[PDB]
Design a protein around this ligand. Structure first.
Ligand code: B12
Length: 192
């Protein structure tokens, strides 16, 4: 069954219980890895398109995204967590597109990297506090809009953790240099 349209429609009409039944069916079909890329991400992108066509209000959108993000954490929670200093993954303050981040987190988790997906738009002061408190080995940011990066002062990301990586269609070597992070175009950041 195309659970995509089903999960989609169940989320657009607020049927959360029903959405969980469809997500669970998708999980049994492709397992975690697949349900993410095949069901979760696509439906999330859909939910986002809908709001970008006025065909959806804010409360409905955030309700859909809250569910999708929760299913993501359950998928991540499924497997153990590898040893090593945690890697915090989020998006820059002001950035609400998180699919890039979700993929980075998942890809890293699939390669044995202890990635902790924090969800999007985390305030620098908090991210820094959390990176320090946990002994995070690295911080990974996904930028889809350039403004959020262009809004930060020089070297704003330098102090976050031992290593800071930036990627996404709104990041580039230039903004990374300016901010104190390492730029990376493809997800093969697995090696670091
Ligand atoms: C979904 C979406 C939303 C959703 C997202 C929800 C969510 N939680 O994710 C929502 C509804 C919330 C949203 C909001 C906005 N967005 Co929007 N929307 C989109 C849409 C449809 C897709 C973006 C997306 O999810 N992209 C996914 C990227 C994330 O994934 P990817 O492609 O696969 O990326 C790859 C690489 O980038 C890389 N990568 C990514 N990250 C990283 C990190 C590292 C370290 C590495 C190595 C690699 C890497 O790997 C990925 C490959 O797998 C586009 C339309 C479009 N044009 O595509 C916009 C778009 C991004 N949204 C857009 C805008 C402007 C907005 C809003 C500000 C709308 C508005 N105009 O008011 C709002 C934000 C609300 C606000 N006031 O703050 C514009 C952006 C303008 C610009 N280019 O500068 C777009 C382009 C729309 C358009 N066509 O005009 N949006």
């Amino acid at each position: 069954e195309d659970l995509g349209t089903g999960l989609l429609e169940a989320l657009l009409r607020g049927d959360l219980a029903g959405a969980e039944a469809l997500f669970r069916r998708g999980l049994r079909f492709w397992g975690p890895e697949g349900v993410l890329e095949h069901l979760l991400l696509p439906v999330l992108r859909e939910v986002g398109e809908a709001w970008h066509r006025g065909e959806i209000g804010v409360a409905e959108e955030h309700l859909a995204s809250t569910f999708l993000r929760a299913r993501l954490q359950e998928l991540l929670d499924l497997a153990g967590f590898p040893p090593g200093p945690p890697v915090l993954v989020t998006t820059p303050p002001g950035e609400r597109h998180e699919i890039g981040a979700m993929l980075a987190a998942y890809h890293l988790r699939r390669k044995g990297v202890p990635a902790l997906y924090l969800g999007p738009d985390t305030p620098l002061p908090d991210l820094r506090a959390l990176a320090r408190r946990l002994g995070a080995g690295a911080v990974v940011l996904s930028a889809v809009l350039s403004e959020p990066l262009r809004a930060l002062p020089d070297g704003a990301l330098k102090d976050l953790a031992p290593r800071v990586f930036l990627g996404g269609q709104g990041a580039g070597p230039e903004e990374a240099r300016r901010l104190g992070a390492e730029y990376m175009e493809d997800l093969k950041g697995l090696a670091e």
